[PDB]
Every structure is written in structure tokens, then in C-alpha cells.
Scaffold this active site. Structure first.
Site, mmCIF file in Angstrom:
data_model
loop_
_atom_site.group_PDB
_atom_site.id
_atom_site.type_symbol
_atom_site.label_atom_id
_atom_site.label_comp_id
_atom_site.label_asym_id
_atom_site.label_seq_id
_atom_site.Cartn_x
_atom_site.Cartn_y
_atom_site.Cartn_z
ATOM 1 N N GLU C 25 -64.797 24.027 35.695
ATOM 2 C CA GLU C 25 -64.058 25.290 35.772
ATOM 3 C C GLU C 25 -62.572 25.047 36.040
ATOM 4 O O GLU C 25 -62.205 24.113 36.758
ATOM 5 C CB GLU C 25 -64.666 26.247 36.810
ATOM 6 N N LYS C 82 -59.516 36.042 37.402
ATOM 7 C CA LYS C 82 -60.809 35.361 37.330
ATOM 8 C C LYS C 82 -61.696 36.032 36.290
ATOM 9 O O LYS C 82 -61.879 37.252 36.305
ATOM 10 C CB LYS C 82 -61.500 35.327 38.696
ATOM 11 N N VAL C 102 -67.834 30.496 37.274
ATOM 12 C CA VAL C 102 -69.057 29.769 36.921
ATOM 13 C C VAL C 102 -69.759 30.420 35.723
ATOM 14 O O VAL C 102 -70.031 29.753 34.719
ATOM 15 C CB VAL C 102 -70.028 29.673 38.121
ATOM 16 N N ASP C 134 -74.994 43.350 46.044
ATOM 17 C CA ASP C 134 -73.891 42.480 45.643
ATOM 18 C C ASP C 134 -74.442 41.112 45.233
ATOM 19 O O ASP C 134 -74.720 40.261 46.081
ATOM 20 C CB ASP C 134 -72.877 42.351 46.791
ATOM 21 N N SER C 136 -74.023 37.822 42.361
ATOM 22 C CA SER C 136 -73.197 37.137 41.370
ATOM 23 C C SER C 136 -73.839 37.200 39.988
ATOM 24 O O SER C 136 -75.061 37.059 39.869
ATOM 25 C CB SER C 136 -72.975 35.682 41.776
ATOM 26 N N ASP C 138 -73.749 35.097 37.837
ATOM 27 C CA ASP C 138 -74.225 33.740 37.580
ATOM 28 C C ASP C 138 -75.731 33.712 37.373
ATOM 29 O O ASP C 138 -76.219 33.160 36.387
ATOM 30 C CB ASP C 138 -73.878 32.816 38.757
ATOM 31 N N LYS C 155 -72.597 28.865 47.453
ATOM 32 C CA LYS C 155 -71.501 28.878 48.425
ATOM 33 C C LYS C 155 -72.005 29.392 49.778
ATOM 34 O O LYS C 155 -72.844 30.297 49.835
ATOM 35 C CB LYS C 155 -70.339 29.737 47.921
HETATM 36 O O1 LIG Z 1 -67.507 30.230 41.626
HETATM 37 C C1 LIG Z 1 -67.356 31.401 41.310
HETATM 38 C C2 LIG Z 1 -65.961 31.915 41.007
HETATM 39 O O2 LIG Z 1 -65.121 30.849 40.541
HETATM 40 C C3 LIG Z 1 -68.563 32.310 41.232
HETATM 41 O O3 LIG Z 1 -68.842 32.637 39.862
HETATM 42 C C4 LIG Z 1 -68.348 33.574 42.074
HETATM 43 O O4 LIG Z 1 -68.370 33.211 43.461
HETATM 44 C C5 LIG Z 1 -69.389 34.668 41.820
HETATM 45 O O5 LIG Z 1 -68.777 35.964 41.875
HETATM 46 P P1 LIG Z 1 -69.261 37.157 42.860
HETATM 47 O O6 LIG Z 1 -70.192 36.515 43.864
HETATM 48 O O7 LIG Z 1 -67.975 37.661 43.470
HETATM 49 O O8 LIG Z 1 -69.924 38.159 41.941
HETATM 50 CA CA LIG Z 2 -70.300 42.131 43.221
HETATM 51 CL CL LIG Z 3 -60.758 30.481 44.545
#
Ligand SMILES: O=C(CO)[C@H](O)[C@H](O)COP(=O)(O)O
Ligand SMILES: [Ca+2]
Ligand SMILES: [Cl-]
Ligand SMILES: O=C(CO)[C@H](O)[C@H](O)COP(=O)(O)O
Ligand SMILES: O=C(CO)[C@H](O)[C@H](O)COP(=O)(O)O
Ligand SMILES: [Ca+2]
Ligand SMILES: [Ca+2]
Ligand SMILES: [Ca+2]
Ligand SMILES: [Cl-]
Ligand SMILES: [Cl-]
Lengths: 302, 302, 302
Positions: C25, C82, C102, C134, C136, C138, C155
Site C-alpha cells: 500500500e 484514502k 488495504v 462499524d 472495515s 476489507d 490493527k
Molecule cells: O489499513 C487500512 C487503511 O490504510 C484499512 O483498510 C482501514 O483501517 C479500514 O478502514 P475502516 O476500518 O476505517 O473502515
Molecule cells: Ca466505518
Molecule cells: Cl495512516
């Protein structure tokens, strides 16, 4: 040679000529048989040159653009079942009349070659959904079906923030037309940031690029109700919250709660809800036709 | 020339001749090695002319219809891992024995050309899932894999309503055979409306039409336990609720709670659970073979 | 003749020769422009023979392997948005600079022909996600995009158990490298069992077999932080829990809470967080290159 599709001449030609077409759910003809509502939506879509395409299920066929004859039945017959994507199979097999929901319509719309669909409000995460898990099939249908859905966000009886969260998880693009907040149906705004799109040509180029990268799947476009016709947020919120308390003491749970709130909301608007709903419906529809025209033009470059 | 599939002669021919085939999870042979159970299910499926197809993983192969030799190991070997869709890759790479779960089996079944799979109960939303997020991979596997799964609904230790809600969100058709309520495993009914299907020919035409419209994906067919063998709902509910209170004071969370409730339920039935489970299993299996025969016939028209 | 892809010579050749390539990334170049960090990751990947491929969006193109010129802007420009999978369409249409997350990166990586991507930590289920929803994007992107993602789990600000549950529901394989517990970012372990993989050749054969059976979709590979650099679990947990209490009394909800916890965590590590994060990042990256080399070798057999 598609056995399941029933497409009218005008719509067939329009698609065959890469001309813009905007899909509509059968509900609009069902509710108001009077030319008053149906003629005005059609008027609003045709303005930008887009061909209106009302979708229904009848006699084991996926009808795209209902005939005057079919419009009659959808108005006269009372017990017409609501059909989402999952109900389609049975609905056809039964050969009855099927009034398709948001989820059901876009599936048929895609199959027919239509790329733009409009409605006043889409389904979403029901209030207390984090516990009840009552979520409209719309949201996960958007992962599958390639389309741009033009609405005023989620219906007011739903949880707007949770819906936005669910769609973010599901990777469905949400664009706000000339706005940076999520449209909350008859209420103009919900405290939810959306990606701004000031130009429909730009927006149509964002969707086109999206489909080329993420494959098929829905681009959701929100256009808020004209502020002059918008209903105060605090009026809607307190009305629902009170109606929920009645269901707590009466002891109502599930999809019995859903239609309760719908009709409890109609009172608290001072009878202005239908006019606010119809106002949004029209402004939204006009946008859809304009976008569909833009999208066809973008696609006509290659 | 498929490197991963290991199909017996009978099943290969049946598929090659568009004759009906009904998939079965390896678990049934694993648990009861005695001809008593295995022979009776096979009997129930073959009745309608459907070829029974027990699926397992062995020696880096996806075995469809286990040999007498393999049946022996699945009975004798104790430490055979349960394999869902996600575990398949590793299971093959390891080259050991893999007892495939509901989710794992239907993936292999589809690959082999099989269109109907049966079990007593499927996975779903675990109780307190709205908080714990413990949800069977089955439910989202049904979005991908084209099949008709014939069961008696979700296993009794699960949250039936929440499961129904999750499947509605995921757009998986749920049909009740000659019933309009969702089958609650050993309990006959859960307070959840399902789309009624009185005729299996009609039902097979609903699935066929569904796949033609919504593409690949599972049609879920529920057939409730014969009422003469049904377990009282109130007996099951109070037994689980009490067993949950023990885990609250003992302080048990996660997938340690799941097998606790399973075996706490076995006691409270008066030792009648195995007979009620086996009764359902058989009635369900018989239906599957009948449906598969109907489905093959519908498909044989084109 | 792909209009959207911008691939450097080295990466193009490597792919064209079935040689290993590991996606990265753009964030890593953005945060530390100094050769210190960027050169060390590149060093760690190249060690096993894998070609490093940093992915970004610039001037309406999906850039795979940024030029020295582009690296400069991503370091100098402050307001770079982002971009996750859903933001891509608009990002290209706008023609600005897009730092892909990601979810966004792996989509582009797949499109380019890359099969392995690495990061220190992936997104997941946010704490209180069972209520807040909430999550991600991903996690659901992993159902679509064919890749092996090498990380140290989710994370630390996220709910590790709930994330594991969500991925199990979504049918995403989770493999632990020489470990049987889920890697909890800077913390070594979370109380979550994962399928052990002691050999990367074996692991690469598990993914390859997975894609052949379950089609496209992500294999998630977790490699925990070296214990000598690991942060005590109890330190991280109490620091977050306290920071959450501040948001309760201050009254903070949504994506305002998320960056609060991030920076509250940085203090409580004794300023050791960046070094622990960087340590993990490097150990993880080294593994990815080694795996990618193994994967290319497995695929080179057929
Ligand atoms: O590494 C990342 C960003 O570079 C992850 O894709 C991000 O932490 C996920 O986004 P969110 O949890 O805010 O929906
Ligand atoms: Ca969200
Ligand atoms: Cl960051
Ligand atoms: O507009 C609709 C019906 O015409 C939506 O599709 C409907 O509101 C969603 O259904 P539910 O929320 O009951 O699952
Ligand atoms: O029948 C099964 C196993 O043979 C189901 O697939 C299983 O109950 C679902 O798994 P879980 O609920 O533990 O995720
Ligand atoms: Ca809750
Ligand atoms: Ca519902
Ligand atoms: Ca689980
Ligand atoms: Cl209505
Ligand atoms: Cl078992």
C-alpha cells in the site's frame, strides 16, 4: 431470444440504440392508479430524454414496461404480493401478478439491459437492527447487480447511520448529488458524510470507472428533498421514538413494528407526508433521467 | 479430466444421464458405522429413484460417494477434522481425512454436478449472535453455491428468528414444504413465516427459475419433523435457557458454550432426542430424493 | 492493452515471467518519505527474490509501482485522500492522487496479476461493532478478490475476536504461520485459534487448492510480531479501555472515536509503538516475499 423478458417496443428500441432508460418499481402505478402521480413521474423522466420503464411480474414473465391492460390489474387487484429478488422464482412459477420491490426490480432491470433505476427511498438497516438483524435484502443485492440507484437515501423509518455503515462494509459507493451529507428521505440530511458529486457527467464517469474495476454492483446516488419541501428532522425523530414506546408497552416485535411506524409517521407530519414524499419522488426521478442521459453519453464515447 | 474429483461409477452415470442425485454429509457414516442408520437414509433417498452421494475428503481428493474401504476409516479413525468451505484447501494439501460440514459439502456437491443436498439441520445465527457475531459460514455460502438444501431448518441450539432474518438479508429463498412456518429442527415450528410450497414439482420449478434469474446460489427447502415425532417447543426452550444460566455463572463464552448446550439438550428430551433427530433426518431425506427426481424431470423438458 | 493500469518495467517482466511479486500500500511511502523505512521494506521483500510493487492512484490511472517522481508527491502533498475499493471510481474520474487502503489496493493488485499483498495490520470489526456496525470493507472484499494477504492480523484498535467471527461467517481462510493463535497486531496473540501452517510451501499449496475449489477470494495469512519486540497485551487493553471511558464522558461516537484511540495508544507504549509497528511490518514483509516465492514455485509445476 429471452423466454422470461417481456419488453415493450419503445424500451427495446431505446436499449438497442444505447439511448437512456430509467427503471421504475410497479408500486407507483399500484398505489395511485390516477394519472395524477404516474403521469408526473413519467413526465419528469422523459424530460431529459430517458425512456421510463416500469417493471412487474405477470403470467410467468418479467414484464419491462407494463401495458395499459396490466396497469389496470395492478390498480384493481388488491392482494398483489411484494416480490424481492428471492421471491422472483416462485412468483414466475405461480404465474400471478408480482409487485417487485427495490431489490427485485434492479435484478430484472439489469437482465433487460437497463442501467439506471429510481425510487423515493430504498430499504436499509431497520432501527434496532444491530440487535434484531432486520435488514433489507436491498443492501446485499447491491454487491451483485450492476446499476445506479437514484433515491433520497433510506426510508425514514430506518436507521440511516447503521445503513451507511452496512453499505460501507459491503463496499457500495454512496454519492451525494451537490451535497456532502446523506439524504434522510423526507428529512433533508442525516449526520453522515457522503462523497460529493456536483456534476452528473462526472458522477456517471465515476460509476462507469467503478464497474470497470470492481465489476458488476450498484452505485448508489442520493439526491436530497428540495429544502422548501423538507420535513423537520426533530419532528420525524420524536414521532418515531414515541411510536416505539407504544410498541414496548403493547409488546410488539418483528415485522409487526415496521408498518406501525409507517402509519404513525403519516399523522405527525400534519398530513403533509404524502406531498413531501411525492415532491421528493419527482425531484429524484428528474435527476435519474438526467443522469441516465449523461451515462449513455459517457458510454457512447467507446 | 478433473484432478480433484473422485466419483464412483453409479453417481458418475446418474449425473451423465441427468438422473437425480442427492448429496449427503460424511458425518452420518462417521457417527453411526452400524448399517442401522446409514442403510436407512440410503433406503429413503433411493425410494424416489435418486442416487445417494456421500461426500468426503481423503488423500488430497474430493471423494463423491465413499468406498466401503473409506467408510471404514471414517468410522474407525477418531480425530477426523470437520471441514467447511474455507478448510478445504488445507484439508486437500494435508492429504488426510476430512469430514465436510454443510458449507463444505455443497461446494464439492456443486463441483461434481450435484444439485440437491440434504441434512437434518443446517447452521445459522447462534443465540446471542447479534452480540457475539457467531454465525455459521453456511448462510453466506448459500449466496455463492447453486443448490437446493433440504433440511428441517436450523439446529435447535441456534437462534431461528435471527437466522431467518440473516437469510432474508442475504437473499436466500426459504420454502416451507406444505407448511407456512419455519421448521425449528426437532421442534416442528418457529414463529417465522415461510413461502409455502405444497407440490415438489412446483417447488422445483421455482428453484430452476430462481437460478435462471439470480444466477448460482442456494434454494433452502424446509420440511418440518412429523408431528407424531415432534418435541415440545417449551421443553427445548426452557432447557437451553437454563443451560445458558450455568454458562453465565461458570463464565463460559465462545465456541465452548456451543457443545455445552448440545449435550445439555440431550438429557432434557428424556433420551428421546436421538430418535427424534433420526426420525427427522429420514423424513427430510425422503423429501430430498423426491424433490431431486422432480427437479431432474423439470430440467429434462429443456 | 489495459487503459487503466500503469505498470513499471520490472514488475511487468516479473509477472510476464511468473516470477514472484508482492504488493504494498502507498501509505508506507506517504508516512515516511525518508529512505529509512521505504528502503528497508523493499530490502525485506527483495531478499526472497520477490519484486516489490507499491500501488497508488494518480492522474486517472491505477499505478502499479510508483516512479521516483510520484513518490515525491505522495510525500510532499498533504491532502491525499484514502481510497478503498468503493472510492476508486471517483478517484480515477477526479484524476488526483489516491492513497489506496488495504481493500482498495488488493483490487488493483489482482487486476495487475499480482497474487500476494502485505501490510502490518488489516481492518476488521471495530470495538462495539456488534452495536455500531462499524466494519472495515476489507472483510467483505476478501470474498471477491483472489489474493494472499500477509499481515499481523487486525490493527490493535479493533475487536480481534469479533473480526475472526466475521471472517469465519464470510468463509475467508485464516492461517497462522508457525502459530495456532491469531496475531493481535503489536500484541503477539489473541485468544482465537487459527489453522497452523509451519511450512510456506505447504501454505502456498493450501491457497492454490483453495482458489481451485472456492474460486477467487482472499487467503488471509497471519504472522505474529517477533516476541522480542511484542507489546504486552494487558498494556494495550487497559490503555484502550481507559481511552474509551474518556469518549463516554466527553460524548464521542462514530469515526471520531477511531483516531482518538489510535493516538491515545501511541502514548501508553512509552513511545515504543512506532518501533514495534515497524518491527512487525518488516518481519511480515519478509514472510510475504518468501511465500510469494513459494507460491510462484508451486504454480510453476503446472
Ligand atoms: O489499513 C487500512 C487503511 O490504510 C484499512 O483498510 C482501514 O483501517 C479500514 O478502514 P475502516 O476500518 O476505517 O473502515
Ligand atoms: Ca466505518
Ligand atoms: Cl495512516
Ligand atoms: O421499497 C421497498 C419495497 O417496495 C424496499 O425494498 C423494502 O422497504 C425493503 O424490505 P424490508 O426492509 O421489509 O426487508
Ligand atoms: O452441520 C454442520 C456441521 O456438520 C454445520 O455446518 C455447523 O453446525 C455450522 O458451524 P458453526 O455453527 O460452528 O459455524
Ligand atoms: Ca447489542
Ligand atoms: Ca426483515
Ligand atoms: Ca463461529
Ligand atoms: Cl407500499
Ligand atoms: Cl457431530
Amino acid at each position: 431470444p429471452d423466454q422470461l423478458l417481456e419488453v415493450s417496443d419503445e424500451i427495446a428500441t431505446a436499449l438497442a440504440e444505447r439511448r437512456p432508460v430509467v427503471a421504475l418499481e410497479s408500486s407507483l402505478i399500484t398505489t395511485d392508479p390516477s394519472s395524477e402521480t404516474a403521469s408526473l413521474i413519467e413526465k419528469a423522466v422523459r424530460g431529459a430524454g430517458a425512456v421510463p420503464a416500469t417493471i412487474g411480474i405477470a403470467g410467468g414473465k418479467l414484464v419491462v414496461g407494463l401495458t395499459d391492460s396490466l396497469i389496470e390489474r395492478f390498480a384493481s387487484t388488491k392482494g398483489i404480493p411484494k416480490i424481492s429478488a428471492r421471491d422472483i422464482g416462485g412468483a414466475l412459477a405461480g404465474g400471478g401478478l408480482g409487485a417487485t420491490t427495490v431489490a427485485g426490480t434492479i435484478v430484472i432491470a439489469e437482465r433487460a439491459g437497463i442501467q439506471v433505476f429510481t425510487t423515493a427511498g430504498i430499504g436499509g438497516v431497520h432501527r434496532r437492527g444491530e440487535d434484531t438483524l432486520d435488514i433489507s435484502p436491498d443492501l446485499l443485492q447491491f454487491r451483485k447487480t450492476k446499476m445506479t440507484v437514484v433515491s433520497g437515501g433510506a426510508k425514514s423509518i430506518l436507521d440511516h447511520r447503521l445503513t451507511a455503515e452496512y453499505l460501507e462494509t459491503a463496499g457500495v459507493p454512496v454519492y451525494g448529488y451537490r451535497t456532502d451529507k446523506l439524504a434522510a428521505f423526507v428529512v433533508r440530511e442525516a449526520d453522515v458524510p457522503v462523497t460529493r458529486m456536483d456534476d452528473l457527467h462526472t458522477a456517471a464517469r465515476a460509476a462507469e470507472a467503478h464497474w470497470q474495476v470492481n465489476g458488476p454492483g450498484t452505485v448508489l446516488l442520493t439526491s436530497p428533498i428540495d429544502e422548501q419541501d423538507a420535513v423537520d428532522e426533530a419532528i420525524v425523530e420524536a414521532a418515531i421514538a414515541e411510536a416505539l414506546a407504544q410498541c414496548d408497552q403493547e409488546g410488539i416485535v418483528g415485522n409487526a413494528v415496521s408498518p406501525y411506524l409507517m402509519k404513525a409517521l403519516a399523522r405527525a407530519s400534519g398530513g403533509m407526508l404524502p406531498k413531501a414524499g411525492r415532491s421528493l419522488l419527482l425531484s429524484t426521478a428528474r435527476v435519474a433521467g438526467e443522469f441516465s442521459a449523461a451515462l449513455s453519453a459517457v458510454q457512447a464515447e467507446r
